[PDB]
Amino acid sequence: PVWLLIALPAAGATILLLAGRRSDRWGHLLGCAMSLAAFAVGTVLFAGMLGRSGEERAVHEALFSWVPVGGLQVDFGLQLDQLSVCFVLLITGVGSLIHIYSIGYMAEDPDRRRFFAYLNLFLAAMLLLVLADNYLGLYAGWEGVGLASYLLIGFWSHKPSAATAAKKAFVVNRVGDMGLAIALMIMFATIGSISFAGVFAAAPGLSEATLSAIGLLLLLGACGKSAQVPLQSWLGDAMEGPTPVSALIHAATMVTAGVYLIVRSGPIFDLAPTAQTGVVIVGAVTLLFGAIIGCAKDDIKKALAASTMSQIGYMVLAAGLGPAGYAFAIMHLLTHGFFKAGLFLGAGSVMHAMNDEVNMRRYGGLRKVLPVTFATFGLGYLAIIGVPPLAGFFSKDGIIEAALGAGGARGVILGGAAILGAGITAFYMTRVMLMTFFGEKRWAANSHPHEAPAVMTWPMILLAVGSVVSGGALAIGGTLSHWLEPVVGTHEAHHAVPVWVVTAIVLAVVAVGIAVAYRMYARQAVPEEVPEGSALTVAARRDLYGDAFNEAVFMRGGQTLTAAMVTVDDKAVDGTAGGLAALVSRTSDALRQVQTGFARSYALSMLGGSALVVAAILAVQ
Amino acid sequence: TFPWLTVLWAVPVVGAAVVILLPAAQQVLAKWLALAVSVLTLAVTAVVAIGFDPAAAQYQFVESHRWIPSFGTGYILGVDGIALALVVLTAVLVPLLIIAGWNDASRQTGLAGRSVQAYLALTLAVEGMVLMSLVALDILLFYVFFEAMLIPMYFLIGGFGGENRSRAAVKFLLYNLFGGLIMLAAVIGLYVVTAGSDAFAAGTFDFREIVAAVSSGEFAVNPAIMNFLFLGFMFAFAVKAPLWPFHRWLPDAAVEATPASAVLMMAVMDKVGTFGMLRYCLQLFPDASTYFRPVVITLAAIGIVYGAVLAIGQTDVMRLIAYTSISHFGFIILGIFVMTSQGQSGSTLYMINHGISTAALFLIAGFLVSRRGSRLIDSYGGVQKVAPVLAGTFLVAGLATLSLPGLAPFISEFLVLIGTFTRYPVVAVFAATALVLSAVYILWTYQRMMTGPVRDGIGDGDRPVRDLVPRELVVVAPLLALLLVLGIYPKPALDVINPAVEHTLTTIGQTDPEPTVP
Ligand SMILES: CCCCCCCCCCC(=O)OC[C@H](COP(=O)(O)O[C@H]1[C@H](O[C@H]2O[C@H](CO)[C@@H](O)[C@H](O)[C@@H]2O)[C@H](O)[C@@H](O)[C@H](O)[C@@H]1O[C@@H]1O[C@H](COC(=O)CCCCCCCCCC)[C@@H](O)[C@H](O)[C@@H]1O)OC(=O)CCCCCCC
């Protein structure tokens, strides 16, 4: 049954958490086994769907009624459709490879069992995300992926940076979660259904305003997950966690969650031209800003984070292209899950060889010291750059072709931004690749490397292969589109300008960026001290000041609100009751003074009791 | 015909009577006997729930006897879906709180050696009186027990607590009793109104008859009198279940009282406020509730955000959890007073989930506070290293109070938020921000405590933070188990609650608004 795909890893994680330290010796084996079982199950189901050609290819379980309250009647259903199967395969394969790599990577660390527990929980969460056929289960998987990202990012709790990064990531993801919750509330209040089937069937009757609101809030949720502006700030800091966590989050499951949300809600976006405009704007902004950030990132992890942000921005732009770019967006998302995952595995190998060195400017010449890891990183590098043999090249060409076909000034601006993103990506990817594999040794202390064990090698080699394979395997003949056609809308091939000229321009800009990078470091050197590029470079090392924008407007303002409300509580709410108490006490003292103890004073009060006489006499009038 | 409901509430009180009457030397036997009485009450609850048919009539296990005809009140019990849910909550919690406060009364002196017995008997009396309130279908009987249960907890706070126990106990009792006395004014006004109307044979307190009369329209009364009586009920239920302005007492008491007693106050007793709001305020005063619905909705949402913010600003663990519970009470009241089937059902399930979640989170924090005798958040750090299981359970509890779907509370908050959107979308968004605020005050707290380098005296010295003991494991495991189960499969509890919510919404002339699309 389809639900097994969700059931397997979660149950695994459950044991990995319920068994405790008693499983420290063998837990990793169970975690990797459960991930591999999920991959096998997904492949089997995909084969079954291939057998059920045409219609009826999509699985749909509808296990049980989940929250049958009033008119909600949300059932805990599942839909492994032609779109969902792609994400299932990507997540399972990349996560299994990352688990296998983490075996060696986390071998020396205690709680390796706990780490694999968290990874299996993450895989379960992402699978539930992509497999739910209604937005309630999608939200469940959404928040589950958020929690898993928190837990894994926070691994190595002794590091305050790890804890802070986990907190920031989860809180930004929670802002995204609030956005998605408002989206669901609108969907229910306007349709009364939360299922994909019902929502997408009622969508045509929805007004442009309701659709715009829903699409905008879903795009906000994606920005949360996929780390688009203004919630893009959390991508960089998360790298304080283990390299495999970054790999899984950025390449396959966590980062791609927003792209998946946009693709699945595609019926909403296509029906919300304003929502599509917002999605495109967010994609362009994220792509450009992340590329500029990567232009300065000196830490391998930080540079990879910027690269992931830029790639996710490209995917968001393509998806906001609507049916035109859904197919290319998903194809690039998968090719990315391959090549960026391989890049992260290679970076982890470099760090493990560099005694946990993070700074790219603190090492080099590794291509002559880590040949297999260097080769895997280089394959993922040729993929992300976009060489014609590379997978990423085909996907990026498709995205840019859709952008160009977008027409008008809007399509031209989008295409130019995408081209500039390609150029900047090439520039900083070149800087990184030269800085580690090429260049002077630049070793620190012992820095005595070695090719990571076979357990690490095999996943990295497979990710490199999937970077060389795929992209072409999904773009040649439009097989990916013909697969997504039944469930993902296809409008037409605009053919505004020949694909040849677009591809030539892409290659030219990639080469121009590569040459700029070479003149920067190939002819020049990799200085140990801060290169000090000044201006944007400075602003670029501070993530375009983006964190400060949060720290200034929100953190400072949030603390202002907190202190203000604390004052209100202690002084207004408590103060009113205290003032009433003080009034009662003062009045009690004043009255008690009336008992002077002189019997003649008491008698005077009693004689003034002629108040009674006068009142009774006046009661006649 | 068996007095299932009567025995349900009688057993805790009789058990308290036996316990307090034990010889001081039988302290261990007293603990065990109190736990046994709690478990017996839970078994009674189990049979009552199993025999209860949510597809059947609104009120079941109805027991009726004449108690005080002169006041028009009779000993009438009957459990509906909502009352059944809260009864199950109280019953499942009370034994766990007992095994949580196992040693809470050890370091007390005096009481002729009965401090342990007094603690346990007070806990049992609170449990039984809360049960009597829940299953009472007589307005005056319910008010009796609702007001009286303040006294056992007033003692439980004052004795068996920190230095400010006297002050916090006084503030708690006075706030709550002032509310209860305002509700007494309202109760007497209701009696006068019923006596003044031809719908009843005489001044009546029978809740079912009054509800039937107000629904049938025969009991037609001036909207002004109804407004004032509704306000009288509302003030007491708001101070009990803390609606934003009136919450002020709860932080101090929850801080000062021992963790088991604080949880008994928040998770169980404060719920009775919202319960009353759901049973009486809406079903006695539908027109007044509707008229005041916007203002109370505003107060509840402001309470949500305000409690979240204050919890963020709290340096004290216990104060933070208390304000978190206040925000959750804002959620519950919002969901109850939106008069939407989604809303009311979600707020009932939210009473359940918040009870369990706050119990777990607050008891875990109480264990942590016991390990090192400081309630200040800054006093901790890197506890996750020394006590991995404590940190794991604390994180799970926080996630629960954080409304994460993998756990129960989300299913309810979601339902409430959804409900609020169909009638007050602005308020719904205003409350939804609490999803972010919860992440803030939960994860920041966990970061400050469990993560980072181990603080001084944390893993060493005379005040180390040792991991959870087996007894704490017994306390904690069932709570997280229920959270998981209700998050994954709320279907049984929702199926029980929905018939009662539908009955209530039919009673007050309200219905879930139709979807925008035709
Ligand atoms: C609709 C509502 C939207 C509102 C969302 C925002 C909510 C809260 C804002 C702040 C926050 O969201 O959270 C930061 C602190 C935690 O402060 P911290 O102390 O935990 O971490 C510090 C760190 O110090 C720790 O970290 C180091 C290293 O580990 C250790 O050496 C130290 O010892 C110590 O441990 C370090 O030293 C300090 O310089 C830093 O301030 C560290 O925080 C920093 O916060 C900044 C802001 O964050 C955010 O994401 C903002 C989220 C905004 C999301 C919306 C974006 C636009 C959306 C448009 C639709 C970032 O630049 C980094 O997040 C960085 O991390 O919360 C608080 O104060 C809350 C106080 C009141 C909040 C009330 C809100 C109403």
**Dist. CA A217–CA A206, nearest whole Å:** 16
Contacts 24+ apart (CB under 8 A), A561-570: A561/B309, A562/B309, A562/B310, A562/B312, A562/B313, A563/B313, A565/B306, A565/B309, A565/B310, A565/B313, A566/B310, A566/B313, A569/B248, A569/B306, A569/B310
Contact at CB, B429 and A68, closer than 8 angstroms? no
DSSP character string of B464-504 = ------HHHHHHHHHHHHHHHHHHH--HHHHHHHHHHHHHH
Residue A513 tokens read as 């960026």
Q: Do A160 and B432 touch (CB under 8 A)?
A: no
| 3 state SS of B251 | helix
Distance CA B147, CA B154 (A): 11
**Over the range B278-289, which residues count as b (16 or more CB within 10 Å of their CB) and which as e?**
bbbbbbbbbebb
Question: Is A189 an interface residue toward B (CB < 8 Å)?
Answer: yes
Pick the residue from chain A with its C-alpha nearest to B398: A147
**Residue B68 structure tokens:** 């005080």
Ligand 1, residue A163: give the atom nearest the CA.
Answer: 29
Contact A140 B382 (CB under 8 A): no
Nearest Cα residue to atom 72 of ligand 1: A558
Does A72 contact B at CB distance below 8 Å?
yes
Counting beta carbons within 10 angstroms of the beta carbon of residue B228, is it exposed (0 to 12), middle (13 to 18) or buried (19 or more)? middle
**Taking CB atoms and an 8 Å cutoff, what residues of chain A touch B502?**
70
Please choose, from the candidates B209, B285, B231, B334, the residue with its C-alpha nearest in 3D space to the C-alpha of residue B508.
Answer: B285
Q: Best interface-test mutation with B: which of A67, A151, A190, A231 has the largest number of B CBs within 10 A?
A: A67
- Using the Cβ of B384 and the Cβ atoms of chain A, whether some distance falls under 8 Å is answered with yes
Number of Cβ within a 10 Å radius of residue A524: 10
CA distance B467 to B465: 7
| All residues at 6 or more sequence positions from B513 whose CB lies less than 8 Å from its CB, including other chains | A189, B340, B422, B423
**Which helix (H) or strand (E) element contains residue B514?**
none
Dist. CA A551 → ligand 1 center (Å): 6
Q: Is A163 exposed, middle or buried (0-12, 13-18, 19+ CB in 10 A)?
A: buried
Distance A171 CA to ligand 1 centre (A): 9
Entry field: residues in chain A:
621
Task: Map out the domains of chain B as residue ranges.
Answer: 1-518
Using a 6 Å cutoff on CB, does residue B444 contact ligand 1?
yes
- How many H-runs (helices) and E-runs (strands) does chain A carry? 28, 4
Q: State which approach was used to obtain the coordinates.
A: cryo-EM
Please check whether residue B366 touches A, CB under 8 A: no
Tokens (6 digits) for B11: 């057993």
**Nearest chain A residue (CA) to B313:** A562
Ligand 1 within 6 A of CB of A171: yes
B366-371: list long-range contacts, CB under 8 Å, 24+ apart. Answer: B366/B100, B366/B258, B366/B259, B366/B260, B366/B262, B366/B263, B366/B318, B367/B259, B367/B468, B367/B472, B368/B317, B368/B394, B368/B449, B368/B465, B369/B259, B369/B317, B369/B318, B370/B259, B371/B463, B371/B464, B371/B465, B371/B466
**In chain A, which among 572-611 make CB contacts under 8 A with chain B?**
573-574, 577
Q: Is the dihedral of CA B128, B130, B133, B134 positive or negative?
A: negative
d(Cα A459, Cα A470) in Å, to the nearest integer? 16
Assigned token pair, A360: 């790219």
Q: Which residue of A has its CA nearest to B442?
A: A167
Nearest C-alpha neighbor of A475 from the set A379, A385, A396: A396
CB A41 within 8 Å of CB A4 = yes
Residue in A65, A175, A185 nearest the CB of B421: A185
Pick from A555, A559, A560 the residue to mutate for probing ligand 1's pocket: most ligand atoms within 8 Å of its CB. Answer: A555
Q: Which residue, among B397, B406, B318, B310, has the nearest Cα to B354 in the 3D structure?
A: B397
Block residue for tokens 């919202």: B274
Query: Do B313 and A565 count as a contact with CB atoms less than 8 A apart?
Result: yes
Separation between Cα atoms, residue A412 and residue A62, nearest integer Å: 44
Tokens 């079903």 label which residue?
A: B283
CA distance A143 to A175: 11
Q: Which of B130, B125, B144 is nearest to B183 (CA)?
A: B144
Q: Which amino acid is at A83?
A: L
Asked if B503 and B425 count as a contact pair (C-beta separation under 8 A), the reply is no
The answer, yes or no, to whether any atom of ligand 1 lies below 6 A from the CB of A167, is yes
Q: Given B309, B439, B451, which is nearest A171 (Cβ)? A: B439
Q: Specify burial of residue A62 (Cβ count, 10 A radius: 0-12, 13-18, 19+).
A: middle
- Show Cβ contacts of residue A285 under 8 Å, excluding neighbours closer than 6 positions: A228, A229, A313
CA distance A303 to A361: 12
CA pair distance A516, A501, nearest whole angstrom:
22
Nearest to B357 by CA among B453, B167, B487, B192: B487
Torsions phi, psi for B65 (to 5 deg):
-145, 155
Smallest CA-to-CA distance from A381 within A421, A437, A340, A353 is with: A340
Print the SS3 string covering A19-64.
CHHHHCCCHHHHHHHHHHHHHHHHHHHHHHHHHCCCCCCCEECCCC
Pair of tokens at residue A342:
């391989």
Q: CB count, 10 Å around CB of A595? A: 10
Q: Which long-range contacts (CB under 8 A, 24 or more apart) does B56-64 make?
A: B58/B499, B58/B500, B58/B503, B59/B137, B59/B208, B61/B4, B61/B5, B61/B135, B62/B137, B63/B3, B63/B5, B63/B6
CA–CA min distance B334, chain A (Å): 15
Cα–Cα distances in Å, from A336 out to A314, B92, B309? Answer: 11, 50, 40
Instruction: Output the DSSP codes for A495-523.
Output: -SS-HHHHHHHHHHHHHHHHHHHIIIIII
Ligand 1 mutation target, pool A157, A158, A164, A282, most atoms within 8 A of CB: A164
Q: Where are the alpha helices (DSSP H) in A437-552?
A: 454-468, 472-475, 479-484, 499-517, 536-541, 546-549
CA-nearest residue to B447 within chain A is: A163
Distance CA A367, CA A437 (A): 4
Apex B86 CA angle, B82 and B90, nearest 5: 165
Task: Say whether A190 and B517 touch across the interface (CB within 8 A).
Answer: yes
Three-state DSSP class for residue B136: strand
Instruction: State the sign of the Cα–Cα–Cα–Cα dihedral B352, B354, B360, B366.
Output: negative
Two structure tokens written together for B513: 């608004």
Report the DSSP pairing between strands B60-68 and B73-79.
antiparallel
For the record, the structure tokens of A552 come out as 């200034």
CB A434 within 8 A of CB A378: no
Nearest protein Cα to ligand 1, atom 50? A168
Helix, strand or coil for residue B76? strand
Geometric angle at alpha carbon A560, from A559 and A564, rounded to 5°: 115
CA distance A196 to A456: 40
Write out chain B residues lying below 8 Å of A144, CB-based.
Answer: 404-406
Q: Are strands B60-68 and A65-67 parallel, antiparallel or unpaired?
A: unpaired
CA–CA gap between residue B501 and residue B310 (Å, rounded): 32
Our CA-based measurement puts residue A571 at a distance from the nearest CA of chain B, in whole angstroms, of 11
Is B65 an interface residue toward A (CB < 8 Å)? no
CB contact A165 to B (< 8 Å): no
